[PDB]
Design an enzyme around this catalytic site. Sequence first.
Site, PDB file in Angstrom:
ATOM      1  N   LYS A 186       1.079  -3.976  10.218  1.00 43.07           N
ATOM      2  CA  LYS A 186       2.164  -3.663   9.295  1.00 43.07           C
ATOM      3  C   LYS A 186       3.208  -2.790   9.950  1.00 43.07           C
ATOM      4  O   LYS A 186       2.881  -1.835  10.689  1.00 43.07           O
ATOM      5  CB  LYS A 186       1.611  -3.008   8.018  1.00 43.07           C
ATOM      6  CG  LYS A 186       2.672  -2.647   6.955  1.00 43.07           C
ATOM      7  CD  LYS A 186       1.992  -2.305   5.615  1.00 43.07           C
ATOM      8  CE  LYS A 186       2.908  -1.556   4.629  1.00 43.07           C
ATOM      9  NZ  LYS A 186       3.754  -0.561   5.334  1.00 43.07           N
ATOM     10  N   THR A 240      -1.197   0.051   9.375  1.00 43.76           N
ATOM     11  CA  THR A 240       0.196   0.489   9.380  1.00 43.76           C
ATOM     12  C   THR A 240       0.417   1.318  10.640  1.00 43.76           C
ATOM     13  O   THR A 240      -0.230   2.344  10.872  1.00 43.76           O
ATOM     14  CB  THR A 240       0.574   1.304   8.111  1.00 43.76           C
ATOM     15  OG1 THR A 240       0.226   0.558   6.943  1.00 43.76           O
ATOM     16  CG2 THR A 240       2.067   1.564   8.060  1.00 43.76           C
ATOM     17  N   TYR A 291      -4.387   4.090   8.485  1.00 43.59           N
ATOM     18  CA  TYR A 291      -3.819   4.540   9.744  1.00 43.59           C
ATOM     19  C   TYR A 291      -4.946   4.580  10.761  1.00 43.59           C
ATOM     20  O   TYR A 291      -6.103   4.819  10.410  1.00 43.59           O
ATOM     21  CB  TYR A 291      -3.152   5.910   9.599  1.00 43.59           C
ATOM     22  CG  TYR A 291      -1.946   5.882   8.684  1.00 43.59           C
ATOM     23  CD1 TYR A 291      -0.792   5.177   9.027  1.00 43.59           C
ATOM     24  CD2 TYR A 291      -1.967   6.535   7.467  1.00 43.59           C
ATOM     25  CE1 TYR A 291       0.324   5.129   8.159  1.00 43.59           C
ATOM     26  CE2 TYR A 291      -0.860   6.504   6.599  1.00 43.59           C
ATOM     27  CZ  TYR A 291       0.283   5.797   6.952  1.00 43.59           C
ATOM     28  OH  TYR A 291       1.369   5.779   6.076  1.00 43.59           O
ATOM     29  N   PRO A 304       0.821  -1.193   0.000  1.00 39.73           N
ATOM     30  CA  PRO A 304       0.000   0.000   0.000  1.00 39.73           C
ATOM     31  C   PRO A 304       0.865   1.257   0.000  1.00 39.73           C
ATOM     32  O   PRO A 304       1.831   1.354   0.758  1.00 39.73           O
ATOM     33  CB  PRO A 304      -0.811  -0.135   1.282  1.00 39.73           C
ATOM     34  CG  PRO A 304      -0.073  -1.058   2.140  1.00 39.73           C
ATOM     35  CD  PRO A 304       0.940  -1.790   1.339  1.00 39.73           C
ATOM     36  N   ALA A 346       0.183   5.561  -1.078  1.00 40.19           N
ATOM     37  CA  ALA A 346      -0.935   6.464  -1.314  1.00 40.19           C
ATOM     38  C   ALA A 346      -0.593   7.497  -2.372  1.00 40.19           C
ATOM     39  O   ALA A 346      -1.446   8.307  -2.748  1.00 40.19           O
ATOM     40  CB  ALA A 346      -1.326   7.161  -0.017  1.00 40.19           C
ATOM     41  N   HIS A 384       8.772   0.152   6.163  1.00 37.98           N
ATOM     42  CA  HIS A 384       8.137   1.238   5.416  1.00 37.98           C
ATOM     43  C   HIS A 384       9.076   1.758   4.307  1.00 37.98           C
ATOM     44  O   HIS A 384       9.138   2.963   4.029  1.00 37.98           O
ATOM     45  CB  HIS A 384       7.763   2.345   6.409  1.00 37.98           C
ATOM     46  CG  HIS A 384       6.598   3.197   6.002  1.00 37.98           C
ATOM     47  ND1 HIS A 384       5.383   3.141   6.647  1.00 37.98           N
ATOM     48  CD2 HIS A 384       6.481   4.177   5.073  1.00 37.98           C
ATOM     49  CE1 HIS A 384       4.563   4.036   6.124  1.00 37.98           C
ATOM     50  NE2 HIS A 384       5.204   4.676   5.164  1.00 37.98           N
ATOM     51  N   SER A 443       7.985  -5.174   7.804  1.00 40.89           N
ATOM     52  CA  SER A 443       8.228  -3.995   6.989  1.00 40.89           C
ATOM     53  C   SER A 443       8.979  -2.954   7.809  1.00 40.89           C
ATOM     54  O   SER A 443       8.786  -2.887   9.023  1.00 40.89           O
ATOM     55  CB  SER A 443       6.888  -3.393   6.523  1.00 40.89           C
ATOM     56  OG  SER A 443       7.096  -2.244   5.695  1.00 40.89           O
ATOM     57  N   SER A 487      -4.308   1.927  -0.250  1.00 37.58           N
ATOM     58  CA  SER A 487      -4.277   2.869   0.870  1.00 37.58           C
ATOM     59  C   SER A 487      -5.559   3.710   0.846  1.00 37.58           C
ATOM     60  O   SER A 487      -5.935   4.270  -0.201  1.00 37.58           O
ATOM     61  CB  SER A 487      -3.034   3.764   0.764  1.00 37.58           C
ATOM     62  OG  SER A 487      -3.113   4.948   1.544  1.00 37.58           O
TER      63      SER A 487
HETATM   64  C1  LIG Z   1       6.564   6.585  -1.881  1.00 36.95           C
HETATM   65  C2  LIG Z   1       6.151   5.591  -0.813  1.00 36.95           C
HETATM   66  C3  LIG Z   1       4.969   5.847  -0.104  1.00 36.95           C
HETATM   67  C4  LIG Z   1       4.501   4.962   0.869  1.00 36.95           C
HETATM   68  N1  LIG Z   1       3.252   5.172   1.450  1.00 36.95           N
HETATM   69  C5  LIG Z   1       2.720   4.223   2.316  1.00 36.95           C
HETATM   70  C6  LIG Z   1       1.368   4.285   2.698  1.00 36.95           C
HETATM   71  O1  LIG Z   1       0.660   5.245   2.361  1.00 36.95           O
HETATM   72  N2  LIG Z   1       0.819   3.285   3.496  1.00 36.95           N
HETATM   73  C7  LIG Z   1       1.586   2.200   3.882  1.00 36.95           C
HETATM   74  O2  LIG Z   1       1.102   1.309   4.596  1.00 36.95           O
HETATM   75  N3  LIG Z   1       2.904   2.116   3.466  1.00 36.95           N
HETATM   76  C8  LIG Z   1       3.478   3.106   2.672  1.00 36.95           C
HETATM   77  N4  LIG Z   1       4.728   2.901   2.087  1.00 36.95           N
HETATM   78  C9  LIG Z   1       5.555   1.709   2.460  1.00 36.95           C
HETATM   79  C10 LIG Z   1       5.223   0.573   1.490  1.00 36.95           C
HETATM   80  O3  LIG Z   1       3.949   0.076   1.829  1.00 36.95           O
HETATM   81  C11 LIG Z   1       6.263  -0.542   1.520  1.00 36.95           C
HETATM   82  O4  LIG Z   1       6.479  -0.949   2.873  1.00 36.95           O
HETATM   83  C12 LIG Z   1       7.583  -0.127   0.850  1.00 36.95           C
HETATM   84  O5  LIG Z   1       7.368   0.466  -0.412  1.00 36.95           O
HETATM   85  C13 LIG Z   1       8.538  -1.286   0.611  1.00 36.95           C
HETATM   86  O6  LIG Z   1       9.802  -0.751   0.289  1.00 36.95           O
HETATM   87  P1  LIG Z   1      10.376  -0.830  -1.218  1.00 36.95           P
HETATM   88  O7  LIG Z   1       9.339  -0.174  -2.117  1.00 36.95           O
HETATM   89  O8  LIG Z   1      11.687  -0.086  -1.325  1.00 36.95           O
HETATM   90  O9  LIG Z   1      10.586  -2.269  -1.569  1.00 36.95           O
HETATM   91  C14 LIG Z   1       5.241   3.814   1.173  1.00 36.95           C
HETATM   92  C15 LIG Z   1       6.424   3.542   0.450  1.00 36.95           C
HETATM   93  C16 LIG Z   1       6.882   4.428  -0.541  1.00 36.95           C
HETATM   94  C17 LIG Z   1       8.159   4.111  -1.266  1.00 36.95           C
END
Ligand SMILES: Cc1cc2nc3c(=O)[nH]c(=O)nc-3n(C[C@H](O)[C@H](O)[C@H](O)COP(=O)(O)O)c2cc1C
Lengths: 370, 368, 367, 353
Positions: free
Chosen positions: A237, A168, A142, A89, A91, A261, A259, A118
Site C-alpha cells: 500500500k 503500508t 506497519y 484501513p 486506525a 495516504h 494510494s 488497522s
Molecule cells: C485520519 C486518517 C488516518 C489514516 N490512518 C491510516 C492507517 O492507520 N493505516 C493505513 O494504512 N492508512 C491510513 N490512512 C490512509 C487511508 O488508508 C486511505 O489511504 C485514505 O483515507 C484515502 O484518502 P481519502 O479518505 O481522502 O479518500 C489514514 C487516512 C486518514 C484520513
Amino acid sequence: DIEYNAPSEIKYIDVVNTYDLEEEASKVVPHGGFNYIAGASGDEWTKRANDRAWKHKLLYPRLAQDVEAPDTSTEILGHKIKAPFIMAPIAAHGLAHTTKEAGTARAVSEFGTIMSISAYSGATFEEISEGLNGGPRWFQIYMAKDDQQNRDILDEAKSDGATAIILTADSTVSGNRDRDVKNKFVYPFGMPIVQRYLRGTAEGMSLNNIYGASKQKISPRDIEEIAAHSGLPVFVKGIQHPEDADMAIKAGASGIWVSNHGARQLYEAPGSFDTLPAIAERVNKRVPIVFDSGVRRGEHVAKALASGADVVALGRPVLFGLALGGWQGAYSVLDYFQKDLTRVMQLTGSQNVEDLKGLDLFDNPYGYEY
Amino acid sequence: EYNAPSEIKYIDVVNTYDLEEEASKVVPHGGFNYIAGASGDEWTKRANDRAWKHKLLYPRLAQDVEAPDTSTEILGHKIKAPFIMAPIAAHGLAHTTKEAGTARAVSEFGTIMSISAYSGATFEEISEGLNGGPRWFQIYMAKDDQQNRDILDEAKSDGATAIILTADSTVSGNRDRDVKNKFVYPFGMPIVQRYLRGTAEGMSLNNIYGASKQKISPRDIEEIAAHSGLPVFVKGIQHPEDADMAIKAGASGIWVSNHGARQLYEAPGSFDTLPAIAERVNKRVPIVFDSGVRRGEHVAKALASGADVVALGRPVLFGLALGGWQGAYSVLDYFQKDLTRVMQLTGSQNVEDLKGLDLFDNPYGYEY
Amino acid sequence: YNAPSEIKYIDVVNTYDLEEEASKVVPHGGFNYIAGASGDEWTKRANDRAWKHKLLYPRLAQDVEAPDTSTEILGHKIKAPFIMAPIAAHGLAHTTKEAGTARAVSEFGTIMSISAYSGATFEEISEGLNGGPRWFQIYMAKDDQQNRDILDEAKSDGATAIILTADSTVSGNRDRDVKNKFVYPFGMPIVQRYLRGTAEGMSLNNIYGASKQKISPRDIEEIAAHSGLPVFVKGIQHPEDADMAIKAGASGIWVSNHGARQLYEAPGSFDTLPAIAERVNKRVPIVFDSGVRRGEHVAKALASGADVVALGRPVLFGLALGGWQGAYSVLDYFQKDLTRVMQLTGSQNVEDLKGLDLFDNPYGYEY
Amino acid sequence: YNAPSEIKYIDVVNTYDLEEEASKVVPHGGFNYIAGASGDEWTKRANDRAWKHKLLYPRLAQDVEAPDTSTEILGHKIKAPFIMAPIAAHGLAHTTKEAGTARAVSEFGTIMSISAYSGATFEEISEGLNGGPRWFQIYMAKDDQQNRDILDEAKSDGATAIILTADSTVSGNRDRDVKNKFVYPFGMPIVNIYGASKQKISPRDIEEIAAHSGLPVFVKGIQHPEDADMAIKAGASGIWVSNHGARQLYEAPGSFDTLPAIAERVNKRVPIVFDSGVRRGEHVAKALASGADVVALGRPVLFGLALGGWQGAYSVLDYFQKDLTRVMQLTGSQNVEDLKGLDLFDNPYGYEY
Ligand SMILES: Cc1cc2nc3c(=O)[nH]c(=O)nc-3n(C[C@H](O)[C@H](O)[C@H](O)COP(=O)(O)O)c2cc1C
Ligand SMILES: Cc1cc2nc3c(=O)[nH]c(=O)nc-3n(C[C@H](O)[C@H](O)[C@H](O)COP(=O)(O)O)c2cc1C
Ligand SMILES: Cc1cc2nc3c(=O)[nH]c(=O)nc-3n(C[C@H](O)[C@H](O)[C@H](O)COP(=O)(O)O)c2cc1C
Ligand SMILES: Cc1cc2nc3c(=O)[nH]c(=O)nc-3n(C[C@H](O)[C@H](O)[C@H](O)COP(=O)(O)O)c2cc1C
Ligand SMILES: [Zn+2]
C-alpha cells in the site's frame, strides 16, 4: 490523561453528497481530532490535487446501450462484494465516534463489503469482531523493527479471521501535517489489538510516535518475508510510481494498492488518480489493483475502474458519516456510494462492473478551471 | 399554491446571463432552482459555459459584408435564424401561460418549437399558441410498446414534423438543488400521465424518469422511425460512436447535448465534444447542438464547429418567467440581433459562411 | 529605525507563516523592502508556483534509513545542500545585523554569502562567523582600483569565492518601495566609497545607479584573474549567459531572478533551471535560488540540475523573529524538512536527490 | 457634462492604478464608456493576461549602458517606440479634450493619431500639436465624395498618414454603455454613429484610399494574418494589429496572442503598429520582440489626461519611456533594434502559473 468526547449518537443520515459531510462532522467532533482526520500535509495542495484529478478525465454519457438494472457486485481474491469499494484501513475511528472501529465494521458488514482493520485500531478485536458479525476483514500493518513483533502481529491477524494483509509502506516517517502541529494534537487512545506484542522501539508506542518507532529501512525482502510467514495474500500500500508495482509483484505481493495516504504523507506530489494509469499499465493484469486517495463520488469509482483499478477504498467520507451517525451514519455513506455508482453505470452504459473497466474517458487538458 | 409569474411584456436584454438572477425574483424558489440547477456541484454546467473560451472568433476586416442573413433551413423548414427551441419540461414552473406562451413567441419569431413529453400543457393548448407554426415532438419513451405508438400518433396528428428521442435520461442526474428543496411537480403531465401511477403532480422527476423506458437500444430508434414515418433525432449525444450508432439505426438527425448539464456529472462541456461528433457524422445528417448557448458568438462557434442549428433552453425560459410570450420573444430577438452583429464582425454574409469560419485555439482556458 | 533585538529559537511549522509573523516586529518600510518584489509581484508568485510544475514521487521498499543531507561545494563540506544567499542590510530585520545571520550560518555548518551592500563591516561579520566559510558578493564599482580594493579586503577577510551579481545594473520596479519612499536608515561600509557620501538616506535606485551598469564578460575574467578565487555569476535565467559566464572564466553558475525583485514579467526561477543545467553540462557547479520555502523545493532543485540552493527571505524573517537563534531555526527546519522528503522519496544521500524522477504537471497551480 | 479641468503632473508608479484614480473624477457614464469593453469584458482581460504567455529573460554581462529608446517610423523620428492610438471624445476625460492630449504627445516627442470622431476641430488639435506630427484616422463613409472631402481636409491639416479602422463596421456589445444608456454630450466637427459609416468595406476600399489619398495607409483592427496579406496587396503601407481595446468582437483572442502570426505573414513588407492592452514597458518590449515596430497607447493616456490634463498625459508618456529604459537595461538591449531580437520564454501555464 486526555479527555476526548466523541459523538455517540447512532442514526441514519441523508447524504446528498459526501463533500457536505466534512462541514457537518466538524460541528460534532472535538476540534483537534476532527482536524487530524480532515487535514493533510503542508498546504494541503496535494489533498486538493487528489480531488481535482477527477476532472482531468471526464465520463461520456452513452445512449441506446441496452442497459437496465446495473449490477455493482464484484469479486476480489474470492470475496463476493456488493459494490466495487472497500473500507480503507484507518486506525483513528475513535476520534469520530465512541463505537470506534466496531461501528464502521458493522456498517461495512451490513453493507456487504470488506473491512480493513488497522492493527493499531483503538477498538479491541472483540468489540470489532461483534461489529463484523462474521464479515470479511483484511489486516493492515506497519513493518516493525522487531522481527518477532512482526511474526506475532501477523499470527494475531490470521487468528482474528484476516483473509489478506495490507503492508503500508509510504509511512516510514510521518508527513508534515500542519493542523496537527498547530493544534498540538495528541491522539488519546491506545492499540489494544497489538499492545501485548510490542517490543524494543515499539514499546510504549501509540499513533503519536508510530512512524518513528516502526521500520524506516523497508526493502523488498520485507514483502517476501511477510508473505512467506503469513501465507495470506499481501497488498503493498502506498504505491504512486509504476516501478514500485514491478518491485512489489516480483517480491511476492498478491495485490497493488495505489494510494498517497489521503495526502497525509509526501507533500507536493501528484494527485493519486493521476498516477493510476501508469501503474495499471505496468501491472499488466498480473495482480488485483485497489486504488484510493480522493474518492468522493460514484463518478470517481467509475473513473478509477476505467483507469485500471479493480476496486477502490473509501476513507474520510465514511468517517465523517460515522461521526454523524455511528454505524448507521457510516452505512448511509456506503449506501450513497452504491446508489451513486448505479446511476453512473446506467448513464455511461455499464451493465456490470467489468463494463466499467472499459469506459472511454474524455481528456481534459484544461484542468479544473476549464 | 404554486405562484408562477403571469405578466406579459417585452423585456430589455443586455445579455442572457443577467436574466437568471432577474427570474429568481419572480419565480417560486422550488421551481426556479429546478430550472436553474444542474448535477453535483454543477461543475459540468460551468464547463458548458467555459467551453466557449476554448475556441475564439477572429474579427475579419474588409470582408465585403453587409446586412448579414441569419435565415436558414433544416429538414424542409425555413427558419429566421439557426436556432430552434429546445424541448423543456413543465413551462408552468416559469409562467402561467406555460408552453402555450413559449409556443407563441417561437412561432411569431419564426423558428421551430420542440414539444417535451413532460409538458404541463396539452397538444391542443400548445397548438393554439403555435397558430400553425412548425413543431417537433420530443418523446420520453414508455416501457409499453402501444403507449409509444399512441403518443407518436397524437404528436403526428397534432402536426409534428420530426420526432426527438431523448436517450440520456434513462435515469435522473444527481441534481442537488432539487434533492435539497425536495422538489415535486405542482401540476400534471397530460401527454405521459398514461404511464405514471398518478398525474405527475406531487411526483419527483426521479420516479417519472423511472417510469419511462430504461433499456433503450438501437431498435427503439428503428421502430420509432418506421412507426412515425418522420425524421427522428437522437438527442443527448456526447460520444461520436453514438452518432454513428444513431445514423445506422435510421436516425435522420443528431442532437448533441448534455441535457444542460442536468444529467451525467463530471463529464465534458458539451461544446468540447462537438467537433469529434461532427467528424463522425461526416455530413450524413443535420446536427443540432445544445447545452450552454448564451450569446450570438456561441451560435457562430457551434456552426463553425460542425453544427447546423443550435437549440436554446434556459435563457428563453428565463425570458418567459419575466414576460410571458413577449418576454420569451425578447430573448429570441436578442439572439438574432447578437448573431447579426457577430456575422458582420467575423465577415460572414450568411449561415453557410458561419460553418466555414476559422477559430483561434485557446490552450490557456478560462483564466487565460 | 527600530529593528527588533530579541534572540530566541523559533518554531517553524512552515516558512511561509514567517512572513506575516515578521510583519508585526519589523518596521513598515524595512519589512516591505524585504517582502516585496517588482510590479504587482506576479513573478514572485511565479517563483512559488513553479514548484507545482514538477512533482515528487513517494517511493516504497527503498532500503533507506537515516538519510544524509551533507554535501561538498568547491572546497567546503556543508551539512545540507543549501547556503545563505547574499542579502543587503540585515539591520532592517534585526539589530544584530549580518553578525546575527553569520552566527546562525556557521553554527549550522554552511557557507555565509556576504553582500557588498551589507550594513556590517568585514570585522563585525568575521566575529559572528568564528572562522566559518564565506563567499563575498560584489556589486561592482565603476572605478577599477576600487573593485581591486574591495576584492582584496574580502579575500583578506577569508572569502573563498566571489559572487558577481550582474542582474541589478538598474533597479527593478519595486512598487512597495516607491510608494513607501524607502531609503536605508544606516550606512553600507564596504561600498561607501563609491556612493559620494553614505548609503544612509539613499534609495536603492541610486545605490544601484552608483554601481557599474556596463558589466561585460571582461569583468568576469578580470575579477577571476585578480582574485585567484572561484567566481560565480549570479542572476542567470537564460542558458546563453551560462555559456558566456563559463567562457569568461567563471567557476560557478548561480541561477536566480533576485527573488523576483528585478526583471518583472519574467518566468519563475525554477522553470528556467533545466535548460540552464542542460547547457552547463556539469562543467561548473550550479547554485539555484528564488522561491525556496520547503525541503521539497530543495529536492526538486537538485533533481533538476542544481548542486545546492541558496536561502533568502525565510532566513531573514527568521532573523527578524529571533536573531541568530531564529535564523538557526529556519536552517534547522530546512535540514529536517529535507531529511523527511529524502526518506519518503527513497534518497539515501544528496546524489540520489539529483537522480530523482519528477512527475510532470501540465495543469499548473489550480490543477 | 462635467469633465475634470485641472492641469498638473501626475506621478505614476503603474498605469493600472490610474483607472480607479480617474474614476473618482470623470462623470460616471463617460468614465465607463472609456474603461468598458464588449460583453463581460473577458477579452479585455485576455488583452491583459496575454503578456503573461511570453516572458522576458534577464540578460547579464551584456555591455549595455544608457539604452536609447528613440526610433523611426515612415521617416518620422520619435523619442520612444510608441505612438498615441486614435481615440474619440477625449473631452469625456478632460475639458481640454484632444488639444490637451495633442500637447502632451507633441512635447514628449511622438505621433498623435487623430480620430475622425474627435470632439475637437483640426484647428483646436493643431494648437495643441504646435508643429508636432499627426496621422488621421478615418471611419469610411458610404459616400465617396465625403471620404475624399475629409481626406483632403486631413491632408491640408498636415496629416502624413491615414488610418483605416475597418474592425468596427458595427458596434461591439458594450454592456456598460447600454446599461448606463450612454449618449455623447457633444458633437464631432470633422465628420447610430457606426451605422452611418460604411458597413460593406471590401479590399477595393483599401486600394482606393491607397491610390487616391497620396498618403500612406494603415489598416487597423487586424487579428488574422490573411487580412494583413489582403491589406498589403490592396496597397496598405502599414498594418495596425488591434482589437480596438476589446471594445469590438467579444470572445476573441487577446490582441498580443495574435501578433506573432501576423508579423510572420507580413514578413517585414511594411511597418507594424500594435495595440490593445499595453500597460508596462515590459509590454512594449514583448510586442517589439514579437514583430511590432511601434505600439500605440490608449486608455492609460486618457486616464492621465483626466487626472492632470496635458501634463497628466505627459506623466504617462514619460512613465512608459522610463519603464522601457529599465526593461532595455535588464534584457540587454542597447537600442530599439535590439528589442526586436529578444528571445521570449514560453509560458504554457498562463496567468495562474
Ligand atoms: C485520519 C486518517 C488516518 C489514516 N490512518 C491510516 C492507517 O492507520 N493505516 C493505513 O494504512 N492508512 C491510513 N490512512 C490512509 C487511508 O488508508 C486511505 O489511504 C485514505 O483515507 C484515502 O484518502 P481519502 O479518505 O481522502 O479518500 C489514514 C487516512 C486518514 C484520513
Ligand atoms: C428546466 C429544463 C427542463 C428540461 N426538460 C427537458 C425535457 O423535458 N426533454 C428534453 O429532451 N430535454 C430537457 N431539458 C434539456 C434541454 O432540452 C436542453 O438540452 C438544454 O436546456 C440546453 O442547455 P441550456 O439551457 O443550459 O443552454 C431540460 C432543460 C431545462 C433547463
Ligand atoms: C532583502 C533582500 C536583499 C537582497 N540583497 C541582495 C544583495 O545585496 N546581493 C545579491 O546578490 N542579491 C540580493 N538579494 C537576492 C538574493 O540573493 C536571492 O537571489 C533571493 O533572495 C532569493 O529569493 P527568495 O528569498 O525569495 O527565495 C536580496 C534579496 C532580498 C530578499
Ligand atoms: C475610449 C476609447 C475610444 C476609442 N475610439 C476609437 C476611435 O475613434 N478610432 C479608432 O480607430 N479606435 C478607437 N479606440 C481604440 C484605440 O484605437 C485602441 O485600439 C485601444 O484604445 C487600444 O487598447 P488599450 O487602450 O486598452 O491599450 C478607442 C478606444 C477607447 C479606449
Ligand atoms: Zn481608384
